[PDB]
Design a protein around this ligand. Structure first.
Ligand SMILES: [Mg+2]
Ligand SMILES: [Mg+2]
Ligand SMILES: [Mg+2]
Ligand SMILES: [Mg+2]
Ligand SMILES: [Mg+2]
Lengths: 36, 49, 107, 51, 219, 49, 47, 62, 83, 26, 145, 101
RNA sequence: CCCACCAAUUUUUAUAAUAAAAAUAACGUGCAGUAAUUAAUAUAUUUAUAAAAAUAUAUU
RNA sequence: UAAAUUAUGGUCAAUUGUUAGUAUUCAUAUUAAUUUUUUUAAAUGUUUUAUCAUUUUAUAAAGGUUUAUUUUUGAAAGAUUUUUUGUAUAAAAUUUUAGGAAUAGUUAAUAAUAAUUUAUAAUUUUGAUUAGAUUGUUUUGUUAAUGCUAUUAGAUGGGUGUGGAAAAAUAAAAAAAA
C-alpha cells in the first residue's frame, strides 16, 4: 500500500477499499458510518 | 405541508436524511401549542390512545 | 402481437400493425391530450399563416435570418454529436458556458 | 530457456481447415441487407478495363 | 382451469395436512400412508431393500441390482435418518471433522447430490469405512475409519472457507492441484462437481481433461 | 435478472408450451400477411436519398 | 366480514413496527490484505 | 522441505523458544506416506507416483 | 510515514539558517543538543522547521542541506543536516 | 483500565468547561 | 514455447510504433500532496480531496471488469455486446417511451465474485402497449432521440 | 480481455458460472498449456488424429545439446540489444523460469 | 507505583476579538489507582478560582 | 436370531531412478529507482507554376476531460470514359476524492428543417451536478500470488466557411508531380 494514498494509516486505506466492496451492505456502511 | 406538499416523496430512506423517525408524536409535543390536531391525527407515528 | 419478428427486425408494435391487432393500454386524460393537441396546434398555425400574412412572413424571415447567421450552421462532427455537453464536456466552463451540467439523461 | 521443446505430432499431422469449428455469426437484418446488396453490386461490377 | 404448481413442494404434491403450515415435514406421514396402501388372494409384500420407481432406474451393476427392488410408488419416502445459513458441503465437512475429533463411529450428514458424491469419492479413496441408509434422500450415516487409534481423516476443509463464496476450477487448476508443491498428489484429494452433475476427484479430472466447481478437500 | 433460475424457467416454459399445444391446439390455418417495414434499424442514420 | 387495513399506514410504519435488522454479519468482510483464493489463505489448521 | 514461521500473534515475537517449539510441533503433527497409506488401506507408492496402473487403486473394489 | 513531513518527498531539502539554540534530550538522557531553525520557500510558500545541527562548526554557513534521521532522543525534530 | 479512566476524566473536564461556558453566557 | 497474450500485444505495439514501451517507469517515485485549504473547509459539498487520488478507469484497485457471462449471454446470441437486453418497465411517463432497467455483471478478481448492477434505458414503444411491470426484451436500433 | 484479446476467463479459478458458460470454462475452451493433448478438433476431424493427440514427442531419449545453465552468479535479466535476431519480440518480456535444469 | 489544576516553555488546527488539542526531572494547590486504606464501574445531575466529591439510578 | 461352508491347488514383495507444475528465508532483499565524488553526439532555405496571381503540399496549441473524444471521407489510390462513382459519424461494460446532496438553455412526443404546442417530463443516495486530482483499456516494479505499485496511445466549437476531410501559424529524423 502506497503511503500517499488515502491518509497515512492502514485503516484509512482499508476503509477506502471497503467502500468499493462488491457487497452492497458493506459498501453502504463503509461510506456512511463515519459521515454519521 | 403534508396535506398539500410542494415536493414529491416527503419521506426517504437514505442513510443521513431519514425523516420518518422525526414524524412521531414526541417531536410535535414541543410545538403542541401551535399544533393542528387534525393534521397531527392524520400524519403522525406512534400516537397514543 | 406480443412478439417481435427476428427475421425482419420488426417490433411487437409493427407485428400487431401488420396483423391488424391493437395493443394500447387505457390512456389517461393527459395522454389523450398529448395525442389530441397536435392536430389542434397544426390547425391553429395554418390558420394564423393564412390569416396574417405580414406577421407570419416577418416571423419566418427573422427565424431564417437567425438560423442562417448561427455560428455552428456547418454539420461537422461537433454539430453531429447527439449530446454535445456530455461528449465535449472538456469545453464546459473554461470555454463554453451555455450548459451548466455535463449530464442530462441516462447516458 | 526453452532450448529444446517439442510439440504434439497432431499439429504436423493435421489436415487443412480441419480446426475451424462451425460458429453461428448472427447479424442485424439491416446488416444482412447491406451486406447482401454490397456483395451483389461487387458481383455485378462490369469487366470493362480494370476488373 | 389451469392451476399453477408453484414451488417444489407443490410440484411434488405435498398434502399440507398440517393446518396452515406448508414447511412442515411430511415424509413420515407419506411413508405411513404408503404402508397402509400396501396389501397384506396371493398378496406378496415388498421387501425392505431401497427401491426405485422405474425399472430403468435399476443400477447397471448386476451385483448392485440385487440390492434394489422395483417398487412402483412405495419406493419414495425412503430412509430413517432425518435432516440434521451455510452450504450443505460446509455442513458435511464440519460434521465429519467434529465427529472424527470425538472418535465417533457414525456421523449423520444431510444427503444431497454433492454430499453423497463426495462421500462416495472418499470411500473410493479409503477415507471412510462405509455408509448406512445411503439411498435416503434426506440424510445418511458415514462410518468413520480408524486405524491404530488415530483417525484416517486428518484435515477436511470445504472450498468455500467462509461458506458464501463458490469457485470454478479450470483444467489448469485441476492439473496444478495434481502437481501441487512440485510433487504428484494422489495423497490429498480435491473433489469437484463437473458441468455434467458428476462428482469426481482431481486425478480423474486431469485424466479426462476437464474441470468443475470445487466442493472440498480431505487428506 | 438472476441467472440461476434459467433452468427452472426453461422447464416451466416447456410445460406451458406443451399445455398450450395439447389444449388450445390449432383451429385451422391462417393466411400469411405480407410483412411491413421496420423503423428501427441498426447503425447510423441514413440519408433521405 | 371486514378488512379495515391501510396500505399507507403499513408503508409509513405507523404504530412503530420493528424488523430486527442483521448486525455485524452483513458488515464484516474479513481481511482484504490478499486475494480470495479457494480453501482460504491457510487451508486447515491444527491447535 | 520448506518452513514458514509467523510469531506476530505471540506477545513476544522475538522468542527463539517459540520458534523451535513451533517447528518441532509442526514436525510432530506430520504423518509419513507409509502411515497415511496404512490408515487408508492403500499402497504407499500408489499415492505420490504417476503410473497409470495406480489409477485402479483409487477406485472401489468391485 | 508521518515522519519527514517537510521533505515533501525529496530525499533532501534546501534550507536557510535563521536561528540556533539548544534543547535538552529526552530523559533519562541529559545534555544540551544544538538545534537550528531553518526556513525554505516551496511553491511560493515559506516553511519553518527545526533540525539537528550536527555539521562541523567551520565556515560561516547560511544554507544547509537536510536529510532524514531517526534518533528518538529529541521530541519535535527529526531532520539532520548533511555533513 | 487507566486509559478508560483518563478518557472519563477528559470527558468530565469537557462537560464542566461547557457548563462554565453556559454560565458565562447567562 | 507457448507465448502468452502479452507477447502478441507487444508484437502489435512494435509493429505500430518502433519498439515497445519498456523503459522501466519509476513506480517508486514519491508522490506528495500539498494541502491548500483549511482543515475541514474543502471547496466541495459532496467529496473532499485530501490525498493522492487513484487515476484511470481499468487501473483502479481493487480491479473491476465487465463480466459477459450472465443471463443475457445465456439466452440471446448478441451480434455485438449489449445489443439485446431483457428488463422490466419502470416508467411510462414520457409519451411513446418506456423506461427499462436492465442488469449486467461486474467482476472483482481480488474478491473473486460478481455483482449485478442496474442501468436504465429509454426504450421506444410506438402503439403504447408497455405497462409498468412488463418484462420486456429490447434491442438496439438507430438514434431516435 | 474483451476487445482484441482471446482470453475468455481466468486461468485457474473463477466465480460460479451457469450452463454453457460453465461447460465451456470447464471442458470445451482451448487450453494450450495442457501437456497430454492439444485442444481437440471439431467432429469428425478428431477421431482420425486419436493416436497423434497423446503427449508431445515419442522420443524420451533426448540428449540436450544446448548451453548449460549458469548457476553462479545467476544473472536475472538478459536484455541484450541485437542486430540480426528476428525473435527479439518473443525474447523480450518477463518469463517464468521453471524447467528440468 | 501513583490522578487533576497552577506554574513554565512550546507545538500543531485555525487568523475568526476565535477556539481546541498535545508535548514537557525539581512549583504551588487539592488527595487520585495498584485485593491499596474506599464493594467496584457506568450513565445522568449538582458545588467550589474550577481540585475533590456529593446526589440518583443501571450493571456486575 | 444363521450360527464360522474349507484340496492353503500357487506364494515368490518393492526399487532401474522418466516429467500432467503458482510455491512461501519478516526483510538485513546477489529486488527495482532517485540521491555523493559535475556524461555526449544532427540540422533549420519546402518545391512547382500560366508572374504583383493561380496549382500541390491536414492533429503532437494541450489542455485539465472518470456515464468523457468516436470517426479517412466527394481528393489521392484508379485502370480507354456513369454521369456524381461510392452508407465514415452511432451503441454496451469498466470510471477518482477522510469528514456525501440535490442538479438544469432541461425529458419525451410532434403535420414542427428554423418546435409560439402537449405531458403526471429528465438527472440522482445503485452516489448525480459543481469543485479537487488525473491523458481511459493486460506494456513498470516486486512477490509463492487474479495482491500491491507505475505509464506523454501524445486525441476537438469565433483565426480565414477554404477544402474530399480543420487538425491550419515551435520543433520532432520525413522524398513532395523529368
Ligand atoms: Mg510521503
Ligand atoms: Mg475537474
Ligand atoms: Mg463509458
Ligand atoms: Mg477519385
Ligand atoms: Mg462517480
Amino acid at each position: 500500500i502506497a503511503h500517499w494514498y488515502c491518509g497515512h494509516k492502514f485503516r484509512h486505506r482499508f476503509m477506502r477499499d471497503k467502500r468499493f466492496h462488491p457487497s452492497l451492505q458493506a459498501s453502504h456502511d463503509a461510506r456512511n458510518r463515519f459521515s454519521k | 405541508d403534508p396535506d398539500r406538499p410542494h415536493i414529491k416523496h416527503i419521506y426517504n430512506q437514505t442513510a443521513l436524511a431519514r425523516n420518518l423517525r422525526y414524524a412521531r408524536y414526541g417531536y410535535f409535543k414541543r410545538d403542541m401549542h401551535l399544533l393542528d390536531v387534525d393534521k397531527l391525527v392524520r400524519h403522525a407515528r406512534l400516537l397514543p390512545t | 402481437g406480443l412478439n417481435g419478428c427476428v427475421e425482419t427486425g420488426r417490433s411487437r408494435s409493427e407485428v400487431a400493425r401488420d396483423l391488424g391487432l391493437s395493443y394500447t393500454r387505457p390512456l389517461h386524460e393527459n395522454e389523450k391530450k398529448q395525442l389530441s393537441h397536435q392536430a389542434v396546434y397544426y390547425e391553429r398555425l395554418a390558420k394564423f399563416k393564412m390569416e396574417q400574412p405580414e406577421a407570419a412572413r416577418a416571423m419566418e424571415r427573422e427565424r431564417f435570418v437567425r438560423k442562417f447567421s448561427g455560428m455552428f450552421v456547418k454539420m461537422d462532427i461537433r454539430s453531429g454529436a447527439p449530446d454535445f455537453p456530455s461528449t465535449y464536456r472538456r469545453l464546459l466552463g473554461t470555454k463554453v458556458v451555455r450548459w451548466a451540467s455535463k449530464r442530462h439523461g441516462p447516458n | 530457456f526453452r532450448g529444446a521443446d517439442t510439440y504434439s505430432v497432431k499439429y504436423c499431422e493435421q489436415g487443412r481447415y480441419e480446426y475451424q469449428r462451425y460458429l453461428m455469426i448472427n447479424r442485424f437484418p439491416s446488416e444482412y441487407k447491406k451486406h447482401f446488396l454490397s456483395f451483389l453490386s461487387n458481383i455485378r461490377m462490369s469487366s470493362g478495363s480494370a476488373t | 382451469g389451469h392451476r399453477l404448481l408453484h414451488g417444489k413442494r407443490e410440484r411434488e404434491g405435498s398434502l399440507f395436512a398440517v393446518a396452515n403450515d406448508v414447511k412442515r415435514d411430511e415424509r413420515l406421514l407419506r411413508q405411513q400412508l404408503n404402508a397402509l396402501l400396501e396389501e397384506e388372494v396371493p398378496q406378496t409384500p415388498l421387501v425392505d431393500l431401497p427401491g426405485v420407481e422405474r425399472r430403468r432406474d435399476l443400477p447397471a451393476d448386476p451385483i448392485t441390482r440385487l440390492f434394489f427392488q422395483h417398487k412402483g410408488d412405495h419406493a419414495l419416502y425412503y430412509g430413517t435418518y432425518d435432516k440434521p445459513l451455510y452450504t450443505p458441503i460446509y455442513d458435511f465437512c464440519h460434521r465429519i471433522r467434529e465427529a472424527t475429533e470425538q472418535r465417533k463411529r457414525f456421523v449423520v450428514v444431510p444427503s444431497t447430490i454433492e454430499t453423497r458424491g463426495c462421500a462416495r469419492v472418499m470411500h473410493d479413496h479409503g477415507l471412510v469405512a462405509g455408509f448406512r441408509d445411503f439411498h435416503n434422500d434426506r440424510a445418511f450415516a458415514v462410518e468413520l475409519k480408524y486405524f491404530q487409534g488415530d483417525s484416517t481423516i486428518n484435515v477436511i476443509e470445504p472450498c468455500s472457507y467462509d461458506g458464501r463464496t463458490e469457485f470454478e476450477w479450470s483444467p489448469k487448476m485441476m492439473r496444478r492441484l495434481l502437481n501441487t508443491h512440485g510433487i504428484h498428489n494422489r495423497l490429498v484429494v480435491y473433489i469437484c462437481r463437473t458441468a455434467d452433475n458428476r462428482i469426481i476427484d482431481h486425478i480423474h479430472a486431469v485424466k479426462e481433461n476437464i474441470g468443475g466447481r470445487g466442493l472440498m478437500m480431505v487428506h | 435478472l438472476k441467472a440461476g433460475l434459467l433452468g427452472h424457467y426453461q422447464q416451466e416454459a416447456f410445460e406451458a408450451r406443451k399445455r398450450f399445444e395439447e389444449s388450445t391446439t390449432y383451429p385451422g390455418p391462417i393466411r400469411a400477411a405480407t410483412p411491413g417495414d421496420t423503423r428501427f434499424y441498426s447503425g447510423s442514420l441514413e440519408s433521405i436519398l | 366480514t371486514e378488512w379495515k387495513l391501510s396500505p399507507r399506514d403499513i408503508v409509513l410504519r405507523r404504530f412503530g413496527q420493528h424488523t430486527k435488522p442483521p448486525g455485524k454479519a452483513a458488515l464484516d468482510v474479513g481481511s482484504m490484505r490478499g486475494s480470495v483464493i479457494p480453501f482460504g489463505r491457510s487451508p486447515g489448521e491444527q491447535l | 522441505a520448506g518452513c514458514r514461521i509467523n510469531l506476530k500473534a505471540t506477545n513476544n515475537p522475538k522468542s527463539p523458544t517459540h520458534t523451535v517449539e513451533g517447528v518441532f510441533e509442526a514436525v510432530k503433527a506430520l504423518r509419513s506416506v507409509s502411515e497415511i497409506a496404512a490408515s487408508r488401506g492403500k499402497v504407499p507408492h500408489s499415492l505420490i507416483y504417476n503410473i497409470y496402473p495406480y489409477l485402479e487403486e483409487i477406485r472401489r473394489r468391485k | 510515514f508521518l515522519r519527514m513531513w517537510f521533505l515533501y518527498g525529496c530525499c533532501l531539502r534546501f534550507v536557510l539558517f535563521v536561528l540556533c539554540y539548544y534543547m535538552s534530550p529526552r530523559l533519562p538522557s541529559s545534555g544540551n543538543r544544538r538545534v537550528l531553525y531553518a526556513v525554505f520557500y516551496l511553491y511560493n510558500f515559506v516553511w519553518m522547521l527545526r533540525c539537528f545541527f550536527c555539521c562541523f562548526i567551520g565556515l560561516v554557513m547560511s544554507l544547509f542541506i537536510i536529510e532524514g534521521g531517526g534518533f528518538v532522543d529529541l521530541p519535535g525534530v527529526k531532520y539532520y543536516t548533511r555533513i | 483500565r487507566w486509559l478508560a479512566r483518563r478518557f472519563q476524566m477528559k470527558k468530565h473536564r469537557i462537560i464542566k468547561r461547557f457548563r462554565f461556558r453556559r454560565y458565562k453566557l447567562a | 514455447p507457448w507465448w502468452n497474450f502479452q507477447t502478441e500485444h507487444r508484437q502489435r505495439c512494435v509493429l505500430m510504433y518502433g519498439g515497445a514501451r519498456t523503459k522501466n517507469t519509476h513506480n517508486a517515485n514519491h508522490r506528495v500532496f500539498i494541502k491548500k485549504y483549511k482543515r475541514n473547509a474543502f471547496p466541495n459539498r459532496t467529496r473532499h480531496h485530501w490525498a493522492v487520488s487513484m487515476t484511470g478507469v481499468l487501473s483502479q484497485r481493487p480491479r473491476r471488469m465487465p463480466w459477459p457471462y450472465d443471463l443475457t449471454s445465456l439466452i440471446f446470441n448478441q451480434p455485438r455486446q449489449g445489443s439485446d437486453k431483457i428488463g422490466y418497465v419502470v416508467g411510462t411517463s414520457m409519451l411513446k417511451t418506456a423506461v427499462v432497467a436492465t442488469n449486467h455483471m461486474v467482476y472483482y478478481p481480488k474478491f473473486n465474485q460478481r455483482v449485478s448492477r442496474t442501468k436504465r434505458f429509454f426504450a421506444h414503444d410506438e402503439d403504447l402497449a408497455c405497462v409498468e411491470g412488463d418484462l420486456v426484451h429490447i434491442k438496439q436500433c438507430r438514434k431516435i432521440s | 480481455g474483451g476487445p482484441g484479446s482471446p482470453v475468455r476467463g481466468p486461468g485457474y479459478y473463477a466465480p460460479p458460472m451457469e450452463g454453457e458458460h460453465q461447460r465451456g470454462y470447464t471442458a470445451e475452451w482451448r487450453d494450450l498449456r495442457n501437456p497430454m493433448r492439444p485442444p481437440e478438433f471439431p467432429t469428425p476431424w478428431e477421431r482420425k488424429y486419436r493416436q497423434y493427440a497423446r503427449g508431445q514427442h515419442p522420443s524420451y531419449d533426448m540428449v540436450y545439446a544446448g548451453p548449460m545453465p549458469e548457476i553462479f552468479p545467476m544473472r536475472r535479466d538478459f536484455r541484450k540489444p541485437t542486430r540480426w535476431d528476428f525473435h527479439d519480440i518473443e525474447k523480450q518480456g518477463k518469463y517464468r523460469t521453471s524447467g528440468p535444469y
